[PDB]
Design a protein around this ligand. Structure first.
Ligand SMILES: *C(=O)[C@@H]([C@@H]1NC(C(=O)O)=C(S[C@@H]2CN[C@H](C(=O)N(C)C)C2)[C@@H]1C)[C@@H](C)O
Length: 501
């Protein structure tokens, strides 16, 4: 008949929305039932009714109460709806009490599971945005005092010590409309190509906002029963790979800025191979002799870009790749985030100079590759990444000069539109620019690009992990995904068509 115990006042966790206010993580009022076993010991004849209302075995529930007969607090069931909780409270079983707290609900479910993340049973962020912005969303729990007897029965409220401070609303950079589009089209591409995993990243090249980030396979954060680590893998930020041919536009940017190269220059790639010591550079397509700079990207001649790299030096190429964020920390503060590796040399040997130029030796993520193409599309200005809505666009860094960036934009537009190019990446009504490639671990189908080519707004990267249907080539598997998703992204954002007659 006299013992004051402190009780936590759970705080209302902050709402998570997309960039337009569409709900993504909502704190839902729930009812948690707990029991005082000392009072349950006085009403044993009520146990089978209480056990059935809780969905528990009659004898197993009796064992649990008997084993905790000296305790004053045990959980019965957490996170019931207010209807279910009041149904058990209506039994008037001595020693059964209720707690009003909150539990997260995710309206979009698996569509944005990896980005939003999830909380645990204690309403604590444990993955994705929920963890990365946990202190912002969690608030501060309150403190209250309650009087319990020496047999554990609640008597009265003493006083409230500290009031609970609710969490703060957080608006993400994701556009839920684009997220739905990217989710389904990436899912359709895996089925059509017989692929098991993949990622797709959409970025606003002016603001650095991540407009969409989907990974396959995915999971429903509202369930998470029998969940495999394969589905919980945020591949766009975690899976590192050699970007290969997709970084040749950045080797070309260093060449165009050195003063020694122009798009009309010719490189002899015959016979499709090149001997560097014991190492032998080899192109996939070996049916070319002379190619201009655009033809080097269209044919993806590793020999052609290696000879250019030897002429300008690997340092100029490393500098461009470093400043656009390849192999660098993103600063997003996401859990499990992997940085990759951009190797550096005091004296770049001839072998490492070539492999750097056509994308071997270094490892990046799909987020880093999208960020790098965002800077190229943004007239050479790199804007830091953001998973939250950007109202005030930060002052970027001019990595590539606007003239050179504009020249590479046109070259990548020809990669998509010229004869023998990646025509499955064309967006109807628009001019699209990009570059296909393949990453190795068995392949990874890559396509990175942006649109409109003449005035870029949206950068996109499509990763398809091991197509089993036919052809692991990026121009065949990933480019059709780019076309469909970019078309919907341009329309939803009211980007005016630049390729109409
Ligand atoms: C770069 O990642 C590799 C090259 N990427 C490109 C590419 O995917 O377009 C070539 S593929 C080669 C050139 N074009 C042919 C094609 O696309 N079809 C016949 C459909 C095949 C290489 C794979 C580079 C590192 O080898």
């Amino acid at each position: 008949g006299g013992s004051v115990r402190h009780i936590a006042i759970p705080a209302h966790r902050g709402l998570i929305t997309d960039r337009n206010g569409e709900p993504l993580a909502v704190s839902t009022p729930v009812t948690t039932l707990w029991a005082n076993p000392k009072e349950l010991m006085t009403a044993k004849e009520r146990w089978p009714q209480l056990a059935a209302a809780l969905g528990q075995d009659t004898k197993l529930f009796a064992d649990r109460i008997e084993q905790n007969a000296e305790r004053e607090f045990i959980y019965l069931v957490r996170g019931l709806t207010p209807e279910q909780g009041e149904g058990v409270i209506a039994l008037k079983v001595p020693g059964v009490y209720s707690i009003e707290e909150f539990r997260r609900f995710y309206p979009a479910g698996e569509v944005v599971a990896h980005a939003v993340g999830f909380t645990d049973v204690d309403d604590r962020g444990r993955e994705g945005i929920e963890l990365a912005f946990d202190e912002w969303l969690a608030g501060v729990p309150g403190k209250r005092q309650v009087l319990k007897d020496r047999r554990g029965r609640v008597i009265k409220d003493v006083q409230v010590t500290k009031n609970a401070k609710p969490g703060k609303t957080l608006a993400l950079s994701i556009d839920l409309r684009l997220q739905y589009l990217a989710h389904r089209e990436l899912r359709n591409a895996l089925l059509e190509n017989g692929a098991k995993a993949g990622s797709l990243v959409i970025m606003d090249v002016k603001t650095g906002e991540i407009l969409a980030m989907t990974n396959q396979p995915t999971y429903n954060p509202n369930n998470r029963r029998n969940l495999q680590p394969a589905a919980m893998r945020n591949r766009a930020m975690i899976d590192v790979f050699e970007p290969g041919s997709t970084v040749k536009p950045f080797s070309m940017s260093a060449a165009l800025a050195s003063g020694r190269w122009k798009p009309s220059d010719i490189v002899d790639v015959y016979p499709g191979t090149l001997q560097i010591g014991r190492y032998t550079i080899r192109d996939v397509s070996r049916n070319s002799r002379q190619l201009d700079l655009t033809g080097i990207l269209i044919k993806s001649s590793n020999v052609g870009i290696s000879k250019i790299a030897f002429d300008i030096g690997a340092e100029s190429i490393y500098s461009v790749m470093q400043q656009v964020g390849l192999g660098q920390d993103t600063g997003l503060g996401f859990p499990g985030e992997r940085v990759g590796n951009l190797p550096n040399h005091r004296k770049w040997p001839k072998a490492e100079t070539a492999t750097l130029a056509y994308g071997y030796g270094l490892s990046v993520t799909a987020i880093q590759l999208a960020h790098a193409y965002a800077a190229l599309a943004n007239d050479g200005k790199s804007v830091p990444l953001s998973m939250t809505r950007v109202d005030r666009v930060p002052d970027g860094v001019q990595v590539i000069s606007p003239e050179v960036a504009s020249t590479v934009q046109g070259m990548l537009q020809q990669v998509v539109e010229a004869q023998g190019g990646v025509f499955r990446a064309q967006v109807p009504g628009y001019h699209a620019a990009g570059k296909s490639g393949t990453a190795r671990k068995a392949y990874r189908s890559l396509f990175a690009g942006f649109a409109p080519a003449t005035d870029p707004r949206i950068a996109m990267v499509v990763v398809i992990d091991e197509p089993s249907k036919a052809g692991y080539f990026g121009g065949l598997v990933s480019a059709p995904v780019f076309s469909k998703v970019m078309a919907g992204a341009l329309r939803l954002m009211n980007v005016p068509p630049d390729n109409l007659p």
